[PDB]
Amino acid sequence: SELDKIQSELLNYTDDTLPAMENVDAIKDKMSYWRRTQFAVLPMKDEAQIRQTIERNNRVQAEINDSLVAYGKTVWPGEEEQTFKRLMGNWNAYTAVTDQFNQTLLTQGADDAYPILANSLSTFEALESDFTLLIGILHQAMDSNKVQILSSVKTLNS
């Protein structure tokens, strides 16, 4: 039925597309904040406050990771899954860098830790661009959903 088409298009939008977009957006926001806290721990002088912040940053990393893993269970085939797979590769790359940064910040200090982040921009930028492309895919899905919904309501003008 034309009316069930409206309901299903709406349900896909409200219960699949929007939660995807909200989730990826929130993960990107958290990742971006987490990234700045990695630089934020470098001017720090007290080694116990450095330790603390790295622990908190690692907690956020795992949250990001858990959210990514959960989000990857919802991805649709095609460009999104492909993009998400790439993102997970760059995420693992970046968390490998991050674990090296943390190990180096905890051991040698910010002077020797800062280059890990500074020289690994291509690793982080690739991660960022995967989020951007993923957000682009979901933005496209949202607008395509809205077009579908608006289209399916044409039956009510009959």
Ligand SMILES: NC(=[NH2+])NCCC[C@@H](N)C(=O)O
């Ligand atoms: N759920 C998810 N992670 N991806 C699919 C989101 C867009 C899909 N509902 C659509 O194209 O309508």
